Amino acid sequence: MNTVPFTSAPIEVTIGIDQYSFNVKENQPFHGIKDIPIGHVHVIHFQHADNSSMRYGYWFDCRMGNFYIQYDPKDGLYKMMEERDGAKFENIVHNFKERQMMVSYPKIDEDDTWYNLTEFVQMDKIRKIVRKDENQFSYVDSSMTTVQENELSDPAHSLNYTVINFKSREAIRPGHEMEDFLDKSYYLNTVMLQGIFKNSSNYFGELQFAFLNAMFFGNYGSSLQWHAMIELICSSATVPKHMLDKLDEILYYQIKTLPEQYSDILLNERVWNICLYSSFQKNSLHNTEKIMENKYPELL
Amino acid sequence: GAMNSSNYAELFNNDIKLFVDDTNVYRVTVHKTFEGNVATKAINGCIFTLNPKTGHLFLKIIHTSVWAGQKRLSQLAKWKTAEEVSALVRSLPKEEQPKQIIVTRKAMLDPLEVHMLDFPNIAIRPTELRLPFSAAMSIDKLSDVVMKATEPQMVLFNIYDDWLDRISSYTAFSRLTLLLRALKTNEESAKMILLSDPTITIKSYHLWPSFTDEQWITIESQMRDLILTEYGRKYNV
């Protein structure tokens, strides 16, 4: 069980850790988060009480280094940083624990929610979408734009999701226009799975990452990517049976976890009605269709 | 974006553009079968591709053989339309290629956009106008060449005959739309109006009668009357 200590909490802030969130008051003696489960990526995230705009946060894996948060009063944000001195770090953490100035990652033993939302998500893949190679953790916020959004403007601070475009030469083979547009199987299976992602695990990893960046930072481009990756599978007549069964599980946990109140801005009505009721795969996502129908029947 | 009354003069500027109408591509007769069920028999169709500035009509005849053993024909017809328009653009020299294609029906946008990905600089545009191009098959010489085709065939017409020698594109397009609107509302009455005087004939190389400027004014008046009458009938007003 790993620890992300905080130097201090100089400004009033809502701190998120994965799907949990805590209120911290200005100059409250808060020295971080302990009992973080090893074996998953995590995200630590922030909304300042005085500016409920720019949600921002850090994707990290504690197996990859000792990470702490420190407030930077110049850039006005909580910054993730790496401590290279292992003994300094163990010493800082042991003190803060002994003085119980840390919140405990509050995992219920029965609860696989975080595993289920991050099953295919790997820190090495995150660092290819969020390029800042001098750090082992990845910064994301509300306003970051996607490589695709920039085509339609700072490339260093962009989310480099795989570009999916149904009306692109990549998506549509010469002489198979109608077939490739109405059945995206060759785009899914040859271009994207065999060609770019290499396997369904990397495809689902990016799908899961896009969703979480949409939900935790209200990142609109992330939301577009999540919907595009769902729609490409639902619009393919030919998908491996294991990918359909896994997609159903992936979407079920995403829909289950969405705040009830954000359904209106995080869920695209056209994509969901198409996927559940019109697409080739309309009968292949039982768990997802049952939760969507019982939780968001308005949207359908 | 969408072409309407507000941006109407754009049709007659010096940017090459084509209208595409797919409404006569897939045509059927519906009949009773011996068992008392219903079946369709496809008949020959055509893509109506018109340069509204020059009057050049690229009439691609759709022979019934292109539907043989195909499913979802009303859907295929949109994609076949898009494939034929793309092939026509590809066959034209660069300086003759259109800068815009306007589809008279919105269901043509995706099929044409997908077939024209090799042409990112050609804008594919819908229109708000209700153009009566469906009535092209009420022009006897167009109907004749479609019904007689035994194979796929492209036939070139000028739908304005020699009008541009005396009038502007704008006026030529307005006359054409009035004639087609008339033929669409009451074909019998419209065609009676066009041929009632046997002294005025159709030249072998033309589609419409050889009316003088004065005779066109009288014809144009009779078509507007035809259209308003039929309207007061439709709507009891």
UniProtKB/Swiss-Prot annotation, chain A:
**Altering S236A: what's the impact?**
No effect on interaction with PRP8
The annotated consequence of S236 to D/E reads: Disrupts interaction with PRP8
Question: GO terms for biological process?
Answer: spliceosomal snRNP assembly; spliceosomal tri-snRNP complex assembly
Q: Which residues carry this modification: Phosphoserine?
A: S236
Q: Where is this region: Leucine-zipper?
A: 244-265
The subcellular location is: Cytoplasm; Nucleus
Q: Which Gene3D superfamilies match?
A: 2.60.34.20, Aar2, C-terminal domain-like
Phosphothreonine modified-residue sites? T257
UniProt's post-translational modification comment states: Phosphorylated on serine and tyrosine residues.
The record, for Pfam families, names: AAR2, AAR2_1st
Organism superkingdom: Eukaryota
Keywords from UniProt, A to Z, are: Cytoplasm, mRNA processing, mRNA splicing, Nucleus, Phosphoprotein
Q: Name one GO cellular component term.
A: U5 snRNP
InterPro entries found in the cross-reference section: AAR2 (IPR007946), AAR2_C (IPR033648), AAR2_C_sf (IPR038514), Aar2_N (IPR033647), AAR2_N_sf (IPR038516)
Q: What else is known?
A: Present with 7330 molecules/cell in log phase SD medium.
SUBUNIT field: Heterodimer. Interacts with PRP8 (via RNase H homology domain and MPN domain), competing with BRR2 for the same binding site. Component of a U5 snRNP complex that contains at least the U5 snRNA, PRP8, SNU114, AAR2, SMB1, SMD1, SMD2, SMD3, SME1, SMX2 and SMX3, but is not a component of the U4/U6-U5 tri-snRNP complex.
Q: What is its biological role? A: Component of the U5 snRNP complex that is required for spliceosome assembly and for pre-mRNA splicing. Involved in splicing pre-mRNA of the A1 cistron and other genes that are important for cell growth.
Name the protein family: Belongs to the AAR2 family.
Q: What is this protein called?
A: A1 cistron-splicing factor AAR2
- Provide the gene name from the record: AAR2
UniProtKB/Swiss-Prot annotation, chain B:
Give the protein's recorded name: Pre-mRNA-splicing factor 8
What's the effect of swapping D21A? Answer: Alters protein folding. Severely impaired growth. Strongly reduced growth at 35 degrees Celsius
Which proteins does it associate with, and in what oligomeric form?
Answer: Component of the U4/U6-U5 tri-snRNP complex composed of the U4, U6 and U5 snRNAs and at least PRP3, PRP4, PRP6, PRP8, PRP18, PRP31, PRP38, SNU13, SNU23, SNU66, SNU114, SPP381, SMB1, SMD1, SMD2, SMD3, SMX2, SMX3, LSM2, LSM3, LSM4, LSM5, LSM6, LSM7, LSM8, BRR2 and DIB1.
Please give the record's comment on domains. The MPN (JAB/Mov34) domain has structural similarity with deubiquitinating enzymes, but lacks the residues that would bind the catalytic metal ion.
From the entire protein, which fragment is shown? Answer: 1836 to 2069 of 2413
For the region RNase H homology domain, give the residue spans. Answer: 7-237
Q: List the disulfide bonds.
A: none
Q: What result follows from mutating D22A?
A: Reduced growth at 30 degrees Celsius. Strongly reduced growth at 16 degrees Celsius. Strongly reduced growth at 35 degrees Celsius
Q: What does this protein do?
A: Functions as a scaffold that mediates the ordered assembly of spliceosomal proteins and snRNAs. Required for association of BRR2 with the spliceosomal U5 snRNP, and the subsequent assembly of the U4/U6-U5 tri-snRNP complex. Functions as a scaffold that positions spliceosomal U2, U5 and U6 snRNAs at splice sites on pre-mRNA substrates, so that splicing can occur. Interacts with both the 5' and the 3' splice site, as well as the branch region. Has a role in branch site-3' splice site selection. Associates with the branch site-3' splice 3'-exon region. Also has a role in cell cycle.
Write down the species: Saccharomyces cerevisiae (strain ATCC 204508 / S288c) (Baker's yeast)
Share any extra remarks. Answer: Present with 468 molecules/cell in log phase SD medium.
Q: Where does this protein reside within or beyond the cell?
A: Nucleus
- Read off the lineage from the record: Eukaryota, Fungi, Dikarya, Ascomycota, Saccharomycotina
What changing R105K does, per the record, is:
Severely impaired growth. Reduced growth at 30 degrees Celsius. Strongly reduced growth at 16 degrees Celsius
* Gene name in the database record: PRP8
